Design a binder for this molecule. Structure first.
Ligand SMILES: [Zn+2]
Ligand SMILES: [Zn+2]
Ligand SMILES: [Zn+2]
Ligand SMILES: [Zn+2]
Ligand SMILES: [Zn+2]
Ligand SMILES: [Zn+2]
Ligand SMILES: [Zn+2]
Length: 304
């Protein structure tokens, strides 16, 4: 009983990954890149018309269990690609010329827990030595200024950095996939909520990427494009001064591997509903975010 305009549980999204692949075999393939702490397959969709030597854009959602609009977004992106391929010139050119690796839910165990026990859960569901407190913050678990600022060393805290960089099965699987595909992957996009921001490196220190002007200009134009649809206002800039310093983030790590276009999206809203954004806003949030994602995709494609 899947719908793009409601929040779907993991059983439903998993079945949707299978069915959307089966329904669109010329555009979609599915693999598992690893398993979670609890042993769930971490699915990944490769969305694109087959072709030789294609560059790729990588996008994940659901790092943080309670940010349900993020998981809804990766499904909407796939929805748009299959619906509009052949009809909308830009999306058709994108899928012909590049592949999108779309990882609909990274932290599946945390996501299941938000549906079964605790809506506001954030972290993974792995155990920690020496305590009964559960979970690591996956966006503090990457090898990027690991565990130095804006991350906690206490396993009982919501930004706990873990026992070591890539200690979590899930972040190890994502980092391994990106390392193994680094020559093809030209951009990295990671979808969170909330607060209406487009962020780029760096978050782990107050320092700026070599191509800061190019990123700043791109984030500025992407926010402008997003606002065209409903007037929704986003801010943008380097993470440490745009939202807060935070070490161990996947976007900073990906950028440090050489992926020059690396962005975090924090979708709606600005706190009225916060993480419990109602289903009635799924459509408007996804459609306007599609504009920014297609803007960024067009830029990447035009500047290879
Ligand atoms: Zn459906
Ligand atoms: Zn169907
Ligand atoms: Zn299953
Ligand atoms: Zn063109
Ligand atoms: Zn988040
Ligand atoms: Zn957030
Ligand atoms: Zn649409």
């Amino acid at each position: 009983g899947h719908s793009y305009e409601k929040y779907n549980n993991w059983e439903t999204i998993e079945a949707w990954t299978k069915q959307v692949t089966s329904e669109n075999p010329d555009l979609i393939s599915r693999t598992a890149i690893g398993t979670t702490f609890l042993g769930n397959n971490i699915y990944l969709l490769k969305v694109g018309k087959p072709g030789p030597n294609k560059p790729a854009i990588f996008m994940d959602c659901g790092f943080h269990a309670r940010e349900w609009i993020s998981h809804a977004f990766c499904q909407w992106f796939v929805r748009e690609a299959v619906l509009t391929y052949g009809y909308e010139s830009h999306m058709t050119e994108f899928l012909n010329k590049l592949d999108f690796y779309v990882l609909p839910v990274l932290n599946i165990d945390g996501y299941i827990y938000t549906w079964t026990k605790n809506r506001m859960w954030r972290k993974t569901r792995s155990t920690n030595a020496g305590t009964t407190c559960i979970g690591t913050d996956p966006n503090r678990n990457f090898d990027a200024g690991w565990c130095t600022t804006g991350a906690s060393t206490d396993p009982c805290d919501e930004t706990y950095c873990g026992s070591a960089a890539e200690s979590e099965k899930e972040t190890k699987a994502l980092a391994d996939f990106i390392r193994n595909n680094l020559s093809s992957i030209k951009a990295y996009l990671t979808i969170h909520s909330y607060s209406q921001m487009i962020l780029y490196p760096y978050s782990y220190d107050y320092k700026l990427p070599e191509n800061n002007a190019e990123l700043n200009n791109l984030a500025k134009a992407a926010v402008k494009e997003l606002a065209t649809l409903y007037g929704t206002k986003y801010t943008y800039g380097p993470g440490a001064t745009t939202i807060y310093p935070a070490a161990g983030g996947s976007d900073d790590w990906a950028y440090d591997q050489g992926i020059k276009y690396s962005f975090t999206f924090e979708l709606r809203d600005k706190g009225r509903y916060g993480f419990i954004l109602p289903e009635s806003q799924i459509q408007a949030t996804c459609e306007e975010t599609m504009l920014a994602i297609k803007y960024v995709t067009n830029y990447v494609l035009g500047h290879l």
